[PDB]
Design an enzyme around this catalytic site. Sequence first.
Site, PDB file in Angstrom:
ATOM      1  N   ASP A 538       1.003  -1.093   0.228  1.00 31.05           N
ATOM      2  CA  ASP A 538       0.095  -0.100  -0.086  1.00 31.05           C
ATOM      3  C   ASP A 538       0.872   1.377   0.018  1.00 31.05           C
ATOM      4  O   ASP A 538       0.904   1.893  -1.110  1.00 31.05           O
ATOM      5  CB  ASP A 538      -1.034  -0.127   0.939  1.00 31.05           C
ATOM      6  CG  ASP A 538      -2.370  -1.211   0.839  1.00 31.05           C
ATOM      7  OD1 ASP A 538      -1.838  -2.137   0.202  1.00 31.05           O
ATOM      8  OD2 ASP A 538      -3.124  -1.178   1.488  1.00 31.05           O
ATOM      9  N   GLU A 735      -1.994  -9.526  11.227  1.00 34.68           N
ATOM     10  CA  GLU A 735      -1.590  -8.999   9.991  1.00 34.68           C
ATOM     11  C   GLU A 735      -0.096  -8.652   9.618  1.00 34.68           C
ATOM     12  O   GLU A 735       0.331  -9.031   8.728  1.00 34.68           O
ATOM     13  CB  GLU A 735      -2.372  -7.700   9.661  1.00 34.68           C
ATOM     14  CG  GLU A 735      -2.583  -7.266   8.264  1.00 34.68           C
ATOM     15  CD  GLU A 735      -3.459  -6.468   8.191  1.00 34.68           C
ATOM     16  OE1 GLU A 735      -4.222  -5.541   8.865  1.00 34.68           O
ATOM     17  OE2 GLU A 735      -3.394  -5.769   6.575  1.00 34.68           O
TER      18      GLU A 735
HETATM   19  C1  LIG Z   1     -15.462  -5.273   8.135  1.00 32.70           C
HETATM   20  C2  LIG Z   1     -15.371  -3.839   7.277  1.00 32.70           C
HETATM   21  C3  LIG Z   1     -14.088  -3.467   7.027  1.00 32.70           C
HETATM   22  N1  LIG Z   1     -14.063  -2.308   6.154  1.00 32.70           N
HETATM   23  C4  LIG Z   1     -12.991  -1.848   5.394  1.00 32.70           C
HETATM   24  C5  LIG Z   1     -12.901  -2.657   4.263  1.00 32.70           C
HETATM   25  C6  LIG Z   1     -11.766  -2.296   3.358  1.00 32.70           C
HETATM   26  C7  LIG Z   1     -10.998  -1.246   3.682  1.00 32.70           C
HETATM   27  N2  LIG Z   1      -9.795  -0.838   2.842  1.00 32.70           N
HETATM   28  C8  LIG Z   1      -9.415  -1.710   1.835  1.00 32.70           C
HETATM   29  C9  LIG Z   1      -8.167  -2.780   2.550  1.00 32.70           C
HETATM   30  C10 LIG Z   1      -8.427  -4.112   1.948  1.00 32.70           C
HETATM   31  C11 LIG Z   1      -7.619  -5.068   2.374  1.00 32.70           C
HETATM   32  C12 LIG Z   1      -6.612  -4.740   3.346  1.00 32.70           C
HETATM   33  C13 LIG Z   1      -5.758  -5.830   3.666  1.00 32.70           C
HETATM   34  N3  LIG Z   1      -4.594  -6.229   2.990  1.00 32.70           N
HETATM   35  C14 LIG Z   1      -3.848  -4.868   2.713  1.00 32.70           C
HETATM   36  C15 LIG Z   1      -2.403  -5.392   2.414  1.00 32.70           C
HETATM   37  O1  LIG Z   1      -1.610  -4.236   1.944  1.00 32.70           O
HETATM   38  C16 LIG Z   1      -2.637  -5.824   1.072  1.00 32.70           C
HETATM   39  O2  LIG Z   1      -1.478  -6.283   0.322  1.00 32.70           O
HETATM   40  C17 LIG Z   1      -3.364  -6.929   1.060  1.00 32.70           C
HETATM   41  O3  LIG Z   1      -3.624  -7.077  -0.340  1.00 32.70           O
HETATM   42  C18 LIG Z   1      -4.766  -6.562   1.743  1.00 32.70           C
HETATM   43  C19 LIG Z   1      -5.579  -8.062   1.929  1.00 32.70           C
HETATM   44  O4  LIG Z   1      -4.989  -8.755   2.897  1.00 32.70           O
HETATM   45  C20 LIG Z   1      -6.521  -3.371   3.646  1.00 32.70           C
HETATM   46  C21 LIG Z   1      -7.282  -2.390   3.247  1.00 32.70           C
HETATM   47  C22 LIG Z   1     -11.260  -0.511   4.738  1.00 32.70           C
HETATM   48  N4  LIG Z   1     -10.437   0.755   5.020  1.00 32.70           N
HETATM   49  O5  LIG Z   1      -9.315   0.929   4.410  1.00 32.70           O
HETATM   50  O6  LIG Z   1     -10.961   1.757   5.849  1.00 32.70           O
HETATM   51  C23 LIG Z   1     -12.352  -0.875   5.386  1.00 32.70           C
HETATM   52  C24 LIG Z   1     -14.786  -1.101   7.066  1.00 32.70           C
HETATM   53  C25 LIG Z   1     -16.137  -1.680   7.461  1.00 32.70           C
HETATM   54  C26 LIG Z   1     -16.790  -0.614   8.595  1.00 32.70           C
HETATM   55  O7  LIG Z   1     -15.966  -3.015   7.983  1.00 32.70           O
END
Ligand SMILES: C[C@@H]1CN(c2ccc(NCc3ccc(CN4C[C@H](O)[C@@H](O)[C@H](O)[C@H]4CO)cc3)c([N+](=O)[O-])c2)C[C@H](C)O1
Length: 765
Positions: A538, A735
């Site tokens: 990221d 994580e």
């Molecule tokens: C349960 C639900 C969660 N939500 C929510 C969902 C998504 C996102 N951002 C997208 C996101 C997606 C995946 C990751 C993990 N990870 C990151 C690594 O960096 C990558 O390499 C790897 O690909 C990846 C997969 O493991 C990190 C961020 C955010 N947010 O950012 O606020 C909030 C909010 C609601 C209230 O509840």
Amino acid sequence: LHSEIGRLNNQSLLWGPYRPNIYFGTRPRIGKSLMTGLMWGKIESYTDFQHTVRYTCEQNEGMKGYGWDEYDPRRGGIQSIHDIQNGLDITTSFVKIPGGAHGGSWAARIKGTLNDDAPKDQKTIVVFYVSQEGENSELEAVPSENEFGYEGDVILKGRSEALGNYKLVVTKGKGVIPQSDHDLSRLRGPGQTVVQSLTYPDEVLWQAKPILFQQLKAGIDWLVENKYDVADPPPPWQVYLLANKPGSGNVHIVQKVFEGDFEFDILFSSESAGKEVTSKDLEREVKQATEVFGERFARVFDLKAPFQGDNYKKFGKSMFSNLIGGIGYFYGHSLVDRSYAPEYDEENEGFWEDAAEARARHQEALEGPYELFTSIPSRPFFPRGFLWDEGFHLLPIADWDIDLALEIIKSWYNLMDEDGWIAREQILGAEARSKVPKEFQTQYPHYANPPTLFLVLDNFVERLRKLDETLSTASVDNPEVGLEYLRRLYPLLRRQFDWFRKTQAGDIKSYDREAYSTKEAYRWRGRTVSHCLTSGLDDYPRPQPPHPGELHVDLMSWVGVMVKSLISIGSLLGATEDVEFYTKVLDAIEHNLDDLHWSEKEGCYCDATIDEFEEHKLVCHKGYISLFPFLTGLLKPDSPKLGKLLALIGDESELWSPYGLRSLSKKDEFYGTAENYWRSPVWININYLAIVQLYNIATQDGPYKETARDLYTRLRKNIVETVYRNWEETGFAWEQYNPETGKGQRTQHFTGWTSLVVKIMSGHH
Ligand SMILES: C[C@@H]1CN(c2ccc(NCc3ccc(CN4C[C@H](O)[C@@H](O)[C@H](O)[C@H]4CO)cc3)c([N+](=O)[O-])c2)C[C@H](C)O1
């Protein structure tokens, strides 16, 4: 013989608790079909149950922990759930009984135990929720003898084209059922299992919690109408007992109330199979599944010193079981912007402002439906397919069940469009969407993700060169079968490779840039001022500002990984024209890595950009990015560059922490800045790659053999102990890990690539 193995695999994998987004629930690998779900909640007041009920997975102060103690998707498993808020320890045992033409039968025992803190006489509402989708399908509750509900088992009889004829039984079970002395009992009974059979439009069946609460609300409404009031109210637990109304419909709610501890069984009997499944059957198959799991674990995951200990074994079985237990089947439409706006070309300076405006045109639309069978990063936070994540997930799984891994790969590759794009995040269906904010739903066809599934194919190829037990490894034991899989898949890999080259190409010829080849150069699309989400890392620092001249070393290395694989596989399929082209590309990437990415001053690989004065500049931020040609296995074991990299890896004042490698060097100006996502923490996936590669050097004659051995030994130990210490103290895989304190941070339940730790412990790469 290939079609034979395929048919048997279909039949073996069809049923599972493939709804990892909820604590416990089953569905088959069929888009529109029968699904079940478990809900539970203490009831102490007139208003509390809406707050206590549990269904979709979370992690908060109220939930201590949960996960699979053992799991195989072919046989079943046991799950533990430790619920602080509801004072309960729940076991869910699920098992599969082969037979018939429809994917067999299954059963589940649900057992709840009050913990030490709970009132001995707590009332717990338990619900089993069943839905069916289909235009031609039917499902009916057999009504009860008794007046107001069931004294015994609840039987649902159903049919569908998918499932043939079947019967689903929710047993009476063991436990004190509270009895009400209220007047209301004259009309609703004193307390008993009750069933409501309802029908709604198929597309909303998944919303179990709201469906449920609307019925509860209608019961309460009925109370108020009929003069049950606060002058003399019935007991809470009786206010929230539904009126019994069994019948036919596409939704069936089964409700029980217990006082103290309880257990009950869910029995699914495929009619096309033998005699119906019994509770006696359930217990026997559970015992059998555990024995088989025991035996497999110790062959496949033979933990090497100093992790031979029983405490390490428990840790291993927990990490492994949670990873594979997270396998889901998902079905529905994706949200994709198919405009191919020109702003997404990012050929302009300031391209990120252009692309934001194209996104603000909201041209995206639902498409599909698609299906995906995949493991996931996180039941409570990320219960869906992530492309580069799955590459890591499938490495331990491949060891366990190569045939299962190939199914998941196949599943991923069937999502690829005619161009060669696969969206990096698969959110399939409204249920899936309910867990993802609107801002993050839309996928874009110009966004890539590391091709890590190639690594799992690499392992398959080596194994290929060199009934449930039979099926699990059928594809390697039968080289005929393995090759057919590759023949069919190979075109798609090639497509993807070409897609990468077309869409993620960097700019050599438009600048003052000399290099061995004029073709090989890569730039991740999708970057913003502070982010490169598509690379997977990221917020790892990248050239400022982003620029159409940028070249990314990680991306180029990924291409290297793909070409090598295409040579392996293409050789084996005799695609001679293909192999020679790949070979020119490998040769070129090897040179271009040095010519464009190697920094002599800093002694490592770097991203590139274009100067304020239009010249090529190296931009060095020492960290995971810097070692990419190494992590991907592209450096010759005898290289001076390799040596320089090993110096960096081992250097405490840069990347080497007591707890694993830092994502970014302590010396970098951006260390521990902003969100600090990849600007210091220790990430197990990248550490895994480092470990595998170090061990590669340590096991060959060469100048670095001894150095690599030392680093492999210590890194392996540091990573395993870090994940393990945290697992012991907290119950969770995390994580990422803090490099200063070793504490796990960001999200819990990350199983998830954190689980590679099983592969690290077992060694022998
Ligand atoms: C349960 C639900 C969660 N939500 C929510 C969902 C998504 C996102 N951002 C997208 C996101 C997606 C995946 C990751 C993990 N990870 C990151 C690594 O960096 C990558 O390499 C790897 O690909 C990846 C997969 O493991 C990190 C961020 C955010 N947010 O950012 O606020 C909030 C909010 C609601 C209230 O509840």
